[PDB]
């Protein structure tokens, strides 16, 4: 339940990648206007280099998701299900901005 202070929202651009970490993980930030504000690994599954900040955002069927930047496979920025190859799927973060803070869920005990 409790939310751990990422980034500044005016720290992302719309509809742009801005990598960050997460307790280690390499992670991508998209900033969707009407939607709030995504988060998938940065490493792409499927070409080897930490790169999904740097893919195309864009509309597939209305969900929309990111093309990776280099065998432009799209991901779904919600599940992180990969379009062209449904054996691969991209990890994902719980995440919510209250003022212009951008947090991250994670857990406890």
């Not at 990422?6 to 990648?17: A, S, V």
């Not at 998209?30 to 709030?36: A, E, K, L, Q, R």
């Not at 999904?52 to 065998?71: Q, T």
């Not at 995440?95 to 212009?100: K, P, S």
Request: hydrophobic fraction near 40%; charge should be negative.
């Amino acid at each position: 339940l409790t939310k751990v202070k990422l980034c500044q929202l005016d720290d992302l651009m719309p509809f742009i990648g801005a990598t960050v970490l997460i307790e280690g993980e390499r992670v991508a930030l998209f900033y969707i206007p009407d939607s709030g504000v995504y988060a998938v690994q940065d490493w792409d599954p499927i070409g080897k280099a930490y790169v999904m900040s740097r893919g195309i955002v864009g509309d597939i069927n209305g969900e929309m998701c990111v093309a990776s930047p280099l065998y432009k496979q799209h991901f779904s920025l919600k599940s992180g299900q990969c379009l062209e190859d449904e054996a691969h799927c991209l990890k994902t973060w719980r995440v919510t901005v209250d003022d212009n803070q951008v947090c991250y869920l994670a857990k406890e005990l």
